[PDB]
Design a binder for this molecule. Structure first.
Ligand SMILES: OCc1ccc(-c2cccc(O)c2-c2nnn[nH]2)cc1
Ligand SMILES: [Ca+2]
Ligand SMILES: [Zn+2]
Ligand SMILES: [Zn+2]
Length: 241
């Protein structure tokens, strides 16, 4: 088994597929996990989502690499055998956007915050092909998110990065905090190199208020948790202000 240095371990309910791990979270939602083997450190796990919406599939976040992302597409083909309509990527960092080329080669429409697309070159990423824009209260402008089905995109404010976005899964009790949210037992807020330490706490709380009835909080670097992930993240961030 892959025992990452950072990120959750493999537990019962997990399926190893190639270099990745998949975990079913709901009848129509799965978590993908991929690993970056860092020099002198070991593997760092990162999570995204796969959502079935009738006769199509929707993806949230790439894996760290193009090859790993192609493996996600192979898993979908094997296990679901439905086409991927679109992918939403949650900010311009390698764990979320490192595999854009694999999505594009597959002909999948990609979406990111306009700011993520603007930052992508400096961050060493390939931009998504479509830009999401947001209202003053953080909700996505619906005309920029056409045919998103159950994906409800929310920009909570600057936190882990200035561009980080979040996604609620309508028709479920799941919401995805990406890298903004850390689990309820987290020791740190992770890599703060690109973070907005002033606004982080309010952004974390804004994500909780946007999806007030989501009981299963999915995040990039821990297993799914309760709403205490939101509260605990915000309390850690209160110390940065
Ligand atoms: O404390 C656990 C932990 C520590 C570091 C990361 C991380 C690693 C590389 C790039 C990164 O952007 C990150 C990162 N993502 N979210 N927060 N830090 C992730 C999780
Ligand atoms: Ca690439
Ligand atoms: Zn990041
Ligand atoms: Zn991350």
């Amino acid at each position: 088994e892959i025992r990452p240095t950072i990120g959750q371990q493999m537990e019962t309910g997990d399926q190893r597929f190639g270099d990745l791990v998949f975990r079913q979270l709901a009848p129509n939602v799965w978590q993908h996990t991929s690993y970056l083997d860092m020099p002198g450190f070991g593997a760092v796990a990162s999570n995204g989502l796969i959502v079935r919406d009738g006769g199509r599939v929707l993806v949230v976040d790439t894996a760290w690499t193009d090859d790993q992302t192609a493996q996600i597409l192979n898993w979908i083909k094997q296990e679901i055998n439905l086409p991927v309509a679109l992918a939403v990527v949650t900010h311009a960092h390698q764990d979320k956007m490192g595999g854009m080329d694999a999505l594009h080669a597959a002909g999948i429409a990609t979406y990111a915050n306009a700011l993520s697309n603007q930052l992508a070159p400096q961050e060493g990423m390939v931009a998504a092909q479509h830009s999401l824009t947001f209202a003053a209260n953080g909700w996505v402008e619906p005309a920029t998110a056409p045919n998103f089905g159950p994906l409800k995109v929310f920009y909570p404010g600057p936190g882990h990065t200035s561009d980080n976005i979040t996604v609620g899964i309508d028709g479920t009790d799941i919401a995805f905090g990406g890298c903004l949210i850390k689990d309820s037992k987290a020791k740190s807020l992770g890599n703060l190199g690109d973070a907005d330490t002033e606004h982080y706490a309010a952004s974390a709380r804004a994500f909780g208020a946007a999806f007030p009835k989501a009981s299963m909080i999915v995040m990039s670097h821990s297993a799914p948790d309760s709403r205490a992930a939101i509260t605990h993240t915000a309390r850690m961030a209160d110390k940065l202000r």
